[PDB]
Design a binder for this molecule. Structure first.
Ligand SMILES: CN1C(=O)[C@](O)(C#Cc2cccc(-n3nc(C(N)=O)c4cccnc43)c2)[C@H]2C[C@H]21
Length: 321
């Protein structure tokens, strides 16, 4: 009953608010209105406008697949964070729902969201360590312990999301952001996230990366939280081999469905439990594929089996396969 009246109060203004107000106002987005969740980003006179109240850091250095993410500063408060540009006509509410109110160290925090014309500008913490993707390119590929370390932390975040019935949708190195010392990893890019109730390829849907895509998704079978696990394992392989699965050998959605899972790419010098863990996460049938909780525990043991985390965050470059 009153829900309709609260949406109207939030519309037309940019206000200091809480995650539940942001979520309900955002559902409408699917002229300058929005909700900011921290005092570090304050509106001025019912407004928060680009280049007036907030400034992109100069010169513009983009991050993200589309160069949509930028460093920025609140002109009033001097606080700095990141902002993701989403075209308004293609905005998806699930992106914010899947990080709004969520409070987890393995998930990047949401600072707010403000519509301005054709843009939804979404604010979030700035992480200086860059993405796991940028790391893999810098180092070439990661040692076995570092890879297990990060994979587990991603799985910790996937546990959190899955408990809340949230599919991430596009898990990969580029969507894992690292702290300035490399000891913490967080998930990012919830643009493909999907609320679940205890398939995907129907209409207003944009899917994840081809190389990390699970067979059920490819063949249009029904889908659940397990697709994140498949992707996370394809990410593990990307970490170990310095390149995506299947790219050194093959029109890639054809081969995912027909061929066996890419267990061959598991490097041979890897200890038995590392390889064994990767394999439980690359079971073609969702039923036999490991859950998040299960894999995380296995990956943790695998790390323990290999002496724990010993390699430095940025050691020597290591040539890929
Ligand atoms: C909370 N939240 C999200 O997670 C969110 O979906 C996002 C995102 C996203 C998409 C691409 C790139 C990056 N991205 N951001 C940083 C950074 N934060 O500095 C960064 C650094 C290196 C590489 N990519 C980076 C972040 C958005 C709803 C809000």
């Amino acid at each position: 009953p009153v829900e309709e009246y609260l949406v109207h109060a939030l519309q037309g203004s940019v206000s200091s608010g809480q995650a539940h107000s942001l979520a309900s106002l955002a559902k409408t987005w699917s002229d300058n209105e929005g909700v900011l969740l921290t005092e570090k980003l304050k509106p001025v006179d019912y407004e928060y406008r680009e280049e007036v109240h907030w400034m992109t850091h100069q010169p513009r250095v983009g991050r993200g697949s589309f160069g949509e993410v930028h460093r920025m500063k609140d002109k009033q408060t001097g606080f700095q964070c990141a902002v993701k540009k989403v075209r308004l006509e293609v905005f998806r509410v699930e992106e914010l729902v899947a990080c709004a109110g969520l409070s987890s160290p393995r998930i990047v925090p949401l600072y707010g969201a403000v519509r301005e014309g054709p843009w939804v500008n979404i604010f979030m913490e700035l992480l200086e360590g860059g993405s796991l993707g940028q790391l893999i390119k810098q180092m070439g590929c990661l040692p076995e312990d570092r890879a297990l370390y990060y994979l587990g932390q991603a799985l910790e975040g996937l546990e959190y999301l899955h408990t809340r019935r949230i599919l991430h949708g596009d898990v990969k190195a580029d969507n894992v952001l690292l702290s300035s010392d490399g000891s913490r990893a967080a998930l990012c890019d919830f643009g493909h996230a999907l609320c679940l109730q205890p398939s995907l390829l129907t209409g207003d849907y944009i899917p994840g990366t081809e190389t990390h895509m699970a067979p059920e998704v490819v063949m249009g079978k029904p889908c659940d939280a397990k697709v994140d696990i498949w992707s996370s394992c394809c990410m593990m392989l990307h970490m170990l081999n310095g390149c995506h699965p299947w790219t050194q050998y093959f029109p890639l959605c054809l081969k995912i469905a027909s061929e066996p899972p890419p267990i061959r790419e598991i490097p041979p010098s890897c200890a038995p439990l590392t390889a064994q863990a990767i394999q439980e996460g690359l079971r073609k049938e969702p039923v036999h594929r490991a859950s998040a909780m299960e894999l995380r525990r296995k990956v943790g043991k695998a790390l323990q089996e290999v002496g724990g985390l010993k390699s430095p965050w940025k050691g020597e470059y290591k040539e890929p396969r």
